[PDB]
Subunit: 442 residues, 3 copies
């Protein structure tokens, strides 16, 4: 994780990388004052017309428009790819925290530039954008909500080191000279922002670029290694949990937030208190390093949100002891096995971060199985491949004092009593280990 | 039609087959107390990745959630198909009547097992599910809504004769042993439910599994047999109506219901009273023995709902004599020609069932045409093939005293006055014949 | 532009062609009293099952149903196409002004007939439809909303010169003879309307029916002609605006309307006053002579509506001096570069039509560029091909006193200051010329 800081229009500008959304080609967290934006850039493995998609979304907890902002950010980026480049490139901008005086739109634009800049994609940037106002005869960079009310110009201009790349303006009937001056006043700031990004690029130094029978032979090799040689594809032992990392309080305008990472699975859960309890779960395709349609929550996202809500509902305080609504949203930023349990753990952190008087913290974990002729092997904290090539995905969440939720998917006829018993015990040990880590963080 | 009865958690469990949704591969009506669920299983004719889809819907008149339940029922079913089976299989569960103390989710799960078991699809069941509660230290099968409020466990468990295959639980922090005790307490009931299903299967004994030039010769033969030999593809006479069957009062929690069957066309219409008149029409793909997307009402269903509403609107009493809202929903469970008129007849039955003081009963029927030489033949109650290969689809509904609705689709340039007049006369005789039967039923 | 007038059920019937939607195969404006309906017919260039789609929409500003009305109009039209005809034919019906006593449905039915008749598509019409009521024992053509309340019959019947082609009725239990009399009373009016349509057809006389290297040589030829010979594909000069045409007050039940045409780009903007400011933009596929899905407004339509709203927002009077909501909807009836600007102009004419005390009229225009070596050429009022084959699409709108909106898309890395300077000045001259024309119209 690398943090780069500067100042922008009288407020702090930080760009973070290396920690969040590692399976996108490039990903960056932009903090502009209290505005926080996660920007990702992901490209298809092989080339597909150049298919570029830019998305912008302001989360409900951050406090047509988003369509206009995605079209805004697409413009200075689209023409700067090599001629003939046909890979499908998808860029996401998620406003996690929104201060209206610290333009989330412009933060997302430089986030989208930086996401691409560190990314692996041959984008010919960097670019940056600024908002220019025109107040009492003086041009201003990124005016506050108050200043924009007395501004005769609502100009957003973007470009690179060499030239202006985009002009998007509304104005109170200003002359051609007044506009022209505003534009190249804006481009002076753009050159500073592009220089700031280039410092980051210089430091980071991104590097730019019968079947079915085979599929069964790999399945048997993974299963043989596990049952016989006692070793898992990532070198783990059968009861080994992946490396754990965790933080709270990542978002200034949220009541509570928790970041929980387990191996290659990472979830950001954001809590909102209002004036009863709900938990939602979002699974972007950049979480698994892919592109594709940005659709409404599918069947799986509805399930995993309800499973998280079920595990957590039992420790939520009553209304007499906590007279507030509680909404938690879990964002899966990276996934390689049980994002849904990571969302449960992130939500517990966010509940404690927000000072919600819960009965007890809750953590979860998913168990696996490799069945063989004479015996079987329980796998603790399975990754995706062990789900795909194993025999079950057995998810258990609860407190130190017992179970609050179970959900199971198996690829065999059934689980014997001994399998279920052994899995529940390893899962009891697993959740206890995870909460020891979470209480260490909290 | 065969009815099989038992007792389940202190309430009656009935499974019916042979009457409803005969064009699905397998179909079953489950009655669990006042809960009523129709479950169908339909497979693609040819095999296609194994595409299995399970659907669950609680109808508005029965009284995220439905997604979780379809997700619930898929789990114990999916792994029990032969390895390498690639037919597209769709399972539909329609909650027609819902008593919250008599689990519609569990009723639908055994319905889906039952639908598959009698179906011809090589499903390796049967399976069954139960809900297990935990109240003052004792496990209970399918607790009532009141009992679940004092329950420390919300466990739903499914499996087959030999093993448990699915566990989905919420719990007030119960230990691993307590959960284990609940699972195999539930599985004792599952083995009883699967044994009951096997009794039904033992009795029923399901058996398990230039082009354009040709079509014109087929069309030419059906039309030739009709015009020359006066015989229709099913052997009917040109003015012969298909066998009629009808009952009332099928749903305990509905204000009125009518089941109307005409040959291979079957509609169940459900009426709801409230505190002005609407008729809706649903056409599931299993009604014609197919699979496919479950979409919102298409143009045809909207058309056929409005045509049903038109035929019926005229005999609905004034508010002074009946001060209630009336919503009727007609479910096409099978189709082979004019489901829309069957829905009209089903709706009239439901109106008389509900004790709605209608002006007069209403029946409908669809007429056809085969034009030849200069001669022609009017067909009474056309099936699908006579619509496709004939010249018109001429639908007339009304009372014994006259016409209340007409809708027509033709495949030739126009209908002469003489064709229209003779068709109207045969349809007058038709609706009178259908109505004589409906009053016999009512 | 040709206008054909007659009388229909005691109200005026006008059919207009030659002015609106010229890029559809056939397009017609029908005025039936105060009802105004635009009807278009467009066919795919090559044939694809005969795919015919009929669409019907009543605009909100004109004052299940639209689906039923579109199916209504499809029926008398569908069977009257040549056997074996496989071109995709799409008919759109847009109710721009709605008087409920002058049936928009029947206006749309004869509009769809006329659209196809003048179209080049081998539709074997014309057809027409009428509404027949039955009041105190007398049949009446197209009864008023009041008269329909005392009518025992709500019959819609359609057909051609030779026969009735469609019967759709609801009725208060009328006999077969009463229904039969109604149909052929209606067909007496149909033959008169079909004769009226036939007069127009006689008058108009419609006539009835390495790749990558090649595209790059065409692009180089357009750019070569522009930069060297100064000649544009339509023979225009680089600073020449396309011919302008403009009218105001096209819709009787709208508070204001403006029609603005610029070459092959045409927009109709409709203003509605209520008891704050919004501008929407619609882009039908017939505007460029194509067929295809009728979807919700896409990203471009959202963008172009907001850009129009942005150009206009600045001249909207304050609430203190104009206490009304203002809604404008701009319909792109024909397009060949910058419809977004056509909407702005249309909107301004409309605001003036509606007597909205705007600060100043607003006009817009789109500029292009052909870059050659170190040389370049600014293009005034670019058509679609000069956008596709040029270097920018630079849109500037404003008043006589300055700029109110700018939006730009470029196909090169950046725009030098002098290019931006040259574009703004030519665009300033452009909008002044357009506004000189618009004030002449107003
Ligand atoms: Mg897992
Ligand atoms: Mg029919
Ligand atoms: Mg343009």
């Amino acid at each position: 994780k690398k943090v780069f800081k500067t100042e922008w229009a009288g407020r702090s500008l930080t760009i973070e990388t290396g920690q969040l959304a590692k399976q996108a080609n490039g990903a960056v967290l932009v903090r502009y004052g209290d505005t926080v934006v996660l920007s990702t850039a992901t490209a298809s493995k092989e080339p597909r017309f150049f298919p570029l998609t830019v998305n912008y979304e302001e989360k409900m907890y951050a406090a047509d428009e988003a369509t206009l902002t995605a079209r805004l950010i697409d413009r200075p980026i689209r023409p700067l790819f090599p001629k003939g480049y046909r890979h499908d490139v998808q860029i996401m901008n998620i406003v996690l925290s929104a201060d209206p005086d610290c333009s989330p739109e412009m933060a997302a634009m430089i986030g989208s530039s930086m996401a691409l800049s560190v990314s692996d994609i041959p984008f010919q940037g960097p670019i940056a954008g600024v908002n220019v106002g025109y107040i009492d005869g003086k041009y201003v960079i990124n005016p506050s909500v108050a200043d924009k009310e007395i501004s005769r110009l609502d100009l957003e201009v973007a470009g690179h080191k060499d030239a202006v790349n985009m002009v998007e303006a509304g104005a109170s009937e200003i002359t051609e000279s007044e506009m022209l001056e505003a534009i190249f006043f804006g481009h002076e700031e753009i050159k500073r922002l592009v220089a700031f990004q280039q410092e980051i690029i210089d430091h980071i130094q991104p590097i730019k670029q019968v079947y079915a029978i085979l599929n069964d032979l790999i399945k048997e090799e993974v299963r043989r290694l596990i049952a016989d040689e006692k070793i898992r594809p990532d070198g783990r032992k059968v009861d080994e949990i992946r490396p754990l990392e965790s933080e709270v309080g990542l978002l200034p305008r949220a009541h509570g937030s928790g970041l929980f990472t387990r191996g290659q699975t990472q979830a950001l859960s954001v809590l909102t208190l209002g004036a009863r309890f709900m938990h939602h779960y979002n699974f972007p395709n950049f979480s698994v390093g892919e592109t594709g349609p940005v659709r409404a929550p599918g069947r799986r996202e509805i399930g995993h949100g309800a499973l998280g809500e079920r595990a957590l509902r039992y420790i939520i305080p009553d209304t007499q002891d906590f007279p507030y609504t509680i909404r938690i949203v879990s964002e899966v930023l990276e996934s390689n096995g049980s994002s849904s349990q990571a969302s449960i753990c992130g939500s517990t952190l966010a509940l404690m971060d927000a000072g919600v008087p819960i009965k007890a913290p809750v953590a979860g974990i998913a168990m696996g199985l490799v069945t063989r002729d004479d015996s079987y092997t329980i796998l603790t904290d399975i990754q995706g491949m062990e789900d795909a090539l194993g025999d079950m995905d057995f998810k258990v969440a609860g407190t130190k004092d017992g179970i609050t939720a179970i959900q199971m998917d198996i690829k065999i006829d059934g689980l014997t009593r001994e399998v279920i018993e052994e899995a529940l015990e390893q899962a009891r040990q697993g959740r206890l280990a995870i909460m020891d880590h979470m209480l260490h963080t909290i």
